[PDB]
Amino acid sequence: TKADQEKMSIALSKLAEEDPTFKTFTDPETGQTIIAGMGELHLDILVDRMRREFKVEVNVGAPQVSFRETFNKESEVEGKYIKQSGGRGQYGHVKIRFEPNKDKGFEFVDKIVGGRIPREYIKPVQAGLENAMASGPLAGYPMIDIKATLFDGSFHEVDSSEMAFKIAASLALKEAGKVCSPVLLEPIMAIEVTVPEQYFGDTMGDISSRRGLIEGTEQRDNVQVIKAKVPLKEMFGYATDLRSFSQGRGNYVMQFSHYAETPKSVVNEIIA
Amino acid sequence: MKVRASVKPICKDCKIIKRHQIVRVICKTQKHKQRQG
Amino acid sequence: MLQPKRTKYRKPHNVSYEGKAKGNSYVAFGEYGLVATKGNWIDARAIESARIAISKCLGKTGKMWIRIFPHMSKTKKPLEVRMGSGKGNPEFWVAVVKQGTVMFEVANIPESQMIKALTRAGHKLPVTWKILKREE
Amino acid sequence: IAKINLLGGQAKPGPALASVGINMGEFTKQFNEKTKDKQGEMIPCVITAYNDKSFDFILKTTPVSILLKQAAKLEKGAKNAKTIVGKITMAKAKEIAQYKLVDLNANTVEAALKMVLGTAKQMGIEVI
RNA sequence: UACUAAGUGGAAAAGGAUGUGAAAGUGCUAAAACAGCAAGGAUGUUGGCUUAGAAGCAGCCAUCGUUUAAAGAGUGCGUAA
RNA sequence: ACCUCGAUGUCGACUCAUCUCAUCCUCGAGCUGAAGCAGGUUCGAAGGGUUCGGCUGUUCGCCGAUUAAAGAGAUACGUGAGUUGGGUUCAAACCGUCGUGAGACAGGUUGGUCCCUAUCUAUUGUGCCCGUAGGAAGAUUGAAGAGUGUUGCUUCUAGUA
RNA sequence: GGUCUUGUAGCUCAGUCGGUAGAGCAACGGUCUGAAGAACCGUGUGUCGGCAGUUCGAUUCUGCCCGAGACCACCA
Structure with a gap:
């Protein structure tokens, strides 16, 4: 409950005065409260203080950092919103190009030469795009890496207004996104592991079996170094998969690398 | 020690013995050996 | 999967597979071949399972030929019905093979993989297959 | 070892x-x-x-198994011997074979050249 | 006169097999053939895609040569190669 | 559509259960991507046992809570000349539908009466005639046999490997 | 499961039914409008569900298939 959230924050205040090394984040998108711990015993003792020392009863789940969205090859559709809700007539209509841009975010290019759209409507329509990508038809993450090219439109009389054009552009963006087969991107962390000799094959087989992008060896002064661009989901239990196999003598560095295309298996897992 | 109906040598060692007039397939490993295959 | 174009009559005799090889009684286009030791009927599904097995174990090249094409068809009398209302409902197509008939031939990637592919093909059908080599 | x-x-x-x-x-x-x-x-x-x-x-001296690329003035050692990648003069190949003659089982320059040809077989470029 | 080792006889197959016996052949060898054993069983060479290395041999693609009586980019097992 | 339409009593529930393993648990072993714990896997195999309730007339179904476990098939959907009849299937009535209406619906609803004096075989206990070679009185062994072959908890070993 | 009916423009419906695809609206251009809507004037769209046949050409006739819709489940 939200009251349970408040009481768990009180428990957080109690438990952070002893050792604040644990980090707590309340994600704005995934929503669930992430709290850091060392290992099985560390999380267990945190739970014990929560339920017995603090009398705080909270459910436990799984870490939450989900995705990003984008879409496939380009297309061009039109948006016509002739509607009204509150006392008079409303209308708007635009024509935009829905084109992907692999390495650039939202971009606008105008193609109004015959006066189909006054300059006053050039800027609002952009915003209509910038808010329309926020939802996806697969799982609802915002669509990025898109180049938008406005082509045409129609400004009518008093029935026309700027927010009507923004809504028409939103309709066009969603329709084109549905047509152009949207795809997903998963977070990918760059993990570097330095082991003298013991867990060469162990880490090789763990990465090959679980997930990750690997290429061979780095041979440091007296150790073996392996860097893997691996999905952030694969860190689940990896902290103890490596540590248990290393008897507690394992270490690495976790740095976020980039968002990468999600394979079909990930497409089947996350969807409801 | 598996049970099948068509024995074919999977590993290098897949020998057979009609021991006590009962056919057992044996291997150097404990997995590839068979019985009444 | 493999069916004739037009059928003047859809309802022939039930079928009898008795007799010896009348047509395609030998291998005449490959280098290795497969012969049936008993007359049977091969339906579309088993034929396609054998064909996909051959395709998978064939590699990148390999030449294969079936001596027959699925021509005959079968009918299914309605279930839970009393005796006598006509004939059955038309169903899957099928090919008839007689006792001692060569059905299939292979070349291109010789005898080792040839015999391997022939075993792969024959391990999908009830017929007690027999492998042979076409002699030139 | x-x-x-x-x-x-x-x-x-x-x-x-x-x-x-x-x-x-x-x-x-x-x-x-x-x-x-x-x-x-x-x-x-x-x-x-x-x-x-x-x-x-x-x-040991620099290995000569795919080192012909140094003599061939190219890189990216070919996996398959389907096409040729370049040309190497026979004089340089024979001089290198003599340079590596003492190292290996070859007892004359000709046998070292045969071994060079054998290791060049994979590369797609032969002793030309 | 041959067969049996299953009580087959005295119910059934897809299947698989150094089961038994016979026949038709095909090669070498008493110099001691084969089995086993004492050994060697090698180099260019860790050939390249690549597993934050291609290395014999995860795999994949080529898929040869030198000495030797012998050694195959290897016959396989197996190793992070 | 082959005997039985000059008659093969059928639902469920209760009791009596028995038998089979094509085994659910308890037994043993092998393999294991089986360190142990925690599991799966295959074989031998019936010695045994395998719960209590709610909804439902009502098996099959679900759930609840339990045991170490909460298997199935066959016995005329075992089991009425063993018990009842909530049940389809009497006469009665009613709702909806259909049918000109009389009447009908694996649609529903309210209910609606199960006869048996036992001959033999069988089978369980209890007896009579005499037998086993003088009569009577005892002691007996034991042939095929009959009956049970279920399992859990706690603690120490030992927080030991 | 059959016993039937239906499948026609972008929606709803007719056909020398063996010799032609057409209506209202959906739908664009114009008229006009201090604002538009509305209204008016002209379009246009067309394997007649898919297959095969007969002949003469099958949208129609015959048969089959597919989708959907109406009727029933021995003993009543």
Whole structure:
């Protein structure tokens, strides 16, 4: 409950005065409260203080950092919103190009030469795009890496207004996104592991079996170094998969690398 | 020690013995050996 | 999967597979071949399972030929019905093979993989297959 | 016993070599000064698995198995012998074979050239 | 006169097999053939895609030569190669 | 559509259960991507046992809570000349539908009466005639046999490997 | 499961039914409008569900298939 959230924050205040090394984040998108711990015993003792020392009863789940969205090859559709809700007539209509841009975010290019759209409507329509990508038809993450090219439109009389054009552009963006087969991107962390000799094959087989992008060896002064661009989901239990196999003598560095295309298996897992 | 109906040598060692007039397939490993295959 | 174009009559005799090889009684286009030791009927599904097995174990090249094409068809009398209302409902197509008939031939990637592919093909059908080599 | 072939710029890389029982700085300095004339290049080394293992390490001249690319003035050693990648003059190939004649089982320049042709077979370029 | 080792006889197959016996052949060898054993079983060479290395041999693609009586980019097992 | 339409009593529930393993648990062993714990896997195999309730007339179904476990098939959907009849299937009535209406719906609803004096075989206990070679009185062994072959908890070993 | 009916423009419906695809609206251009809507004037869209046949050409006739819709489940 939200009251349970408040009481768990009180428990957080109690438990952070002893050792604040644990980090707590309340994600704005995934929503669930992430709290850091060392290992099985560390999380267990945190739970014990929560339920017995603090009398705080909270459910436990799984870490939450989900995705990003984008879409496939380009297309061009039109948006016509002739509607009204509150006392008079409303209308708007635009024509935009829905084109992907692999390495650039939202971009606008105008193609109004015959006066189909006054300059006053050039800027609002952009915003209509910038808010329309926020939802996806697969799982609802915002669509990025898109180049938008406005082509045409129609400004009518008093029935026309700027927010009507923004809504028409939103309709066009969603329709084109549905047509152009949207795809997903998963977070990918760059993990570097330095082991003298013991867990060469162990880490090789763990990465090959679980997930990750690997290429061979780095041979440091007296150790073996392996860097893997691996999905952030694969860190689940990896902290103890490596540590248990290393008897507690394992270490690495976790740095976020980039968002990468999600394979079909990930497409089947996350969807409801 | 598996049970099948068509024995074919999977590993290098897949020998057979009609021991006590009962056919057992044996291997150097404990997995590839068979019985009444 | 493999069916004739037009059928003047859809309802022939039930079928009898008795007799010896009348047509395609030998291998005449490959280098290795497969012969049936008993007359049977091969339906579309088993034929396609054998064909996909051959395709998978064939590699990148390999030449294969079936001596027959699925021509005959079968009918299914309605279930839970009393005796006598006509004939059955038309169903899957099928090919008839007689006792001692060569059905299939292979070349291109010789005898080792040839015999391997022939075993792969024959391990999908009830017929007690027999492998042979076409002699030139 | 294993085979090793690594950069001549420094003998410090290689944990397996240091774990045999020889001090890191020892073979590092020794190799780096024995290759001081020409280093910063790929060199095949050989060592044994000795118990005391004070120093039982030696090097060899630059390997000639795909080194014809140096003589062929190209890179990207071909996997398949389907097309030719370039041309090498026979004089240079024979001179290199003589240069490596003492190393191998070859007892005349011709046998070393036969081995060069055999190792060039995979590359797609032959002794031309 | 041959067969049996299953009580087959005295119910059934897809299947698989150094089961038994016979026949038709095909090669070498008493110099001691084959089995086993004492050994060797090598080099260019760690050939390249690549597993934050291609290395014999995860795999993949080529898929040769030198000495030898012998050694195959290897016959396989197996190793992080 | 082959005997039985000059008659093969059928639902469920209760009791009596028995038998089979094509085994659910308890037994043993092998393999294991089986460190142990925690599991799966295959074989031998019936010695045994395998719960209590709610909804439902009502098996099959679900759930609840339990045991170490909460298997199935066959016995005329075992089991009425063993018990009842909530049940389809009497006469009665009613709702909806259909049918000109009389009447009908694996649609529903309210209910609606199960006869048996036992001859033999069988089978369980209890007896009579005499037998086993003088009569009577005892002691007996034991042939095929009959009956039970279920399992859990706690603690120490030992927080030991 | 059959016993039937239906499948026609972008929606709803007719056909020398063996010799032609057409209506209202959906739908664009114009008229006009201090604002538009509305209204008016002209379009246009067309394997007649898919297959096969007969002949003469099958949208129609015959048969089959597919989708959907109406009727029933021995003993009543």
